[PDB]
Design a protein around this nucleic acid. Sequence first.
RNA 1: CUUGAGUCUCGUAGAGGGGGGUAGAAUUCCAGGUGUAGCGGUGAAAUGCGUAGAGAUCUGGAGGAAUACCGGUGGCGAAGGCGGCCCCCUGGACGAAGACUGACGCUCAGGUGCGAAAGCGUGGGGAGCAAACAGGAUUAGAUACCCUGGUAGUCCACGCCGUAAACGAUGUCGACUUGGAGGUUGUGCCCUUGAGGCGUGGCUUCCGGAGCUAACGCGUUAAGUCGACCGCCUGGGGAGUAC
Lengths: 18, 55, 100, 88, 117
Amino acid sequence: FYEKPTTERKRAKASAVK
Amino acid sequence: EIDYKDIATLKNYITESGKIVPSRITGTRAKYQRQLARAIKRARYLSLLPYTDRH
Amino acid sequence: MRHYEIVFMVHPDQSEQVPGMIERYTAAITGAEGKIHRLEDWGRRQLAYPINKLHKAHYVLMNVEAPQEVIDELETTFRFNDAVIRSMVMRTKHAVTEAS
Amino acid sequence: SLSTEATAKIVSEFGRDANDTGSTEVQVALLTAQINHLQGHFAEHKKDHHSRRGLLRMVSQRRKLLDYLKRKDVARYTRLIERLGLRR
Amino acid sequence: RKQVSDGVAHIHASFNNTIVTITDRQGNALGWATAGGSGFRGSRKSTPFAAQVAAERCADAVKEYGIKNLEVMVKGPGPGRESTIRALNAAGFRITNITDVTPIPHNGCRPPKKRRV
RNA sequence: CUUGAGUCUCGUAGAGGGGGGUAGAAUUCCAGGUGUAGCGGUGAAAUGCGUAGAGAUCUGGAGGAAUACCGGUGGCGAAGGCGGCCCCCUGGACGAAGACUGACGCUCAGGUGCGAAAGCGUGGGGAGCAAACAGGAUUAGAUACCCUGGUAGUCCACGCCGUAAACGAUGUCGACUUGGAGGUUGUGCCCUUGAGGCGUGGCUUCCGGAGCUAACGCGUUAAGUCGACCGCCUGGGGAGUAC
């Protein structure tokens, strides 16, 4: 994506952090 | 302490193919990890240690 | 004058002229106030992976405290040379004692 | 950049004594030594914009120290900027 | 004929098709059979039920050469990866090693910006 | 005058820039060998590629473009942005003690300079990818989604453009004001025995009463309590449009 993957890896840190 | 040719104490910080093992599998304090990564990358370059298992 | 801890590699099947590399490089670097402070030759070895023909190669170190201007012309001497394979000049890394 | 002895001589002759780094003329001439060195860099690259920010920062601080010389003590100002050729 | 008795089996497990080629270490592909070309066509009828068809025909296609213990390496993901291993092993062969060596890149090129729906 | 601001001694970290090389995987192409009737493609399909030797395989060779793993709620930068490795030049930042100037400061209309991506100009380059354009399905129709090709562009140097949901939708600077848990980078003392304990810095992410808010929420990195400057707002459309 060149701009999503830094967003999902900085969103799903809402998914898979706790 | 660390350098790029202590090749003995690096096969404990890579896998069989040479993919650097992450920190969250070893826990080496985010600095020794960087230095290890550079050592490992310039050891793959210089061919002491393989890029990939087919490399 | 900054510390430069370098590493060479030459085709393994002419280690006869490795002393030629010595008598060239060490002389040319000592000419400029250089000193080969901790030199060690691991000699004939086995790579992690092949290089252009053969799985073997020939490791030597030089590991100088050279001035910066002469080591780059050394690298130029590598660049067109055939008997060498890969160099890796480094930087002082906050110059430390013998490694291995 | 600039070396330790290169700054040491500037602190030496331009300071009222040894270790007078702080007097504004020492700072001015040390900054102008560095600027004169870096013109030779920036004439080589011309696409290094993340260093002309630093060059401009120190040219701006040099002008800001010079104006302070001008108000506080004129004689040192008019004796320095010809020892440097400064304030063209 | 030559009867090398061993060989490196190839499973180019693509997604729409999983063709398999049998060979020894020199890279001399002597026999091969195509899952999606084993009479079968389409996509869901070229799925690994066809892969075992290709495996059995290839076993028939090279049973004249007498290859007993078999090395296999795979390319690509896909359903035509697992069932074919069991099929070829049960089809008069003996295994040597299984792997899928599908070439992950080091960020080299651009593959397409395909379906979006 | 020394507390504001700045110089020097000294180290610490870093995808901060600019210029050079350099490696290997991966797509593609080309040459070679083996041998073979399909390959690809999707919700089924043809266009396509191919019986010549395609796909598949290994052997090499050319080129261009990006740097798997580490990698992170990480780091750096004024922002835009910056990830292989090594060197050359360079820019900041921070921390330990010191020394030195003596208010040298903050903000800044105009002004100057940097400004993602597209786009333009003149010459190269061009592997993939691909607006446009072709051909095949879809649909009621399809100029779209979908597939097969595919040019500009994407890459490089020089020049221009100046815009973005350029966003923390939070201007810069300073002072004050309960706590907790992390992160990253210095450092002081302690048997560092060590990992650290006791402290101290900086940057940083997440909770949370005071307080503030319409509210969500912010909450020592404030949207709290104040100060100095600057920019902007004044119902929706018309309109960021005409001139």
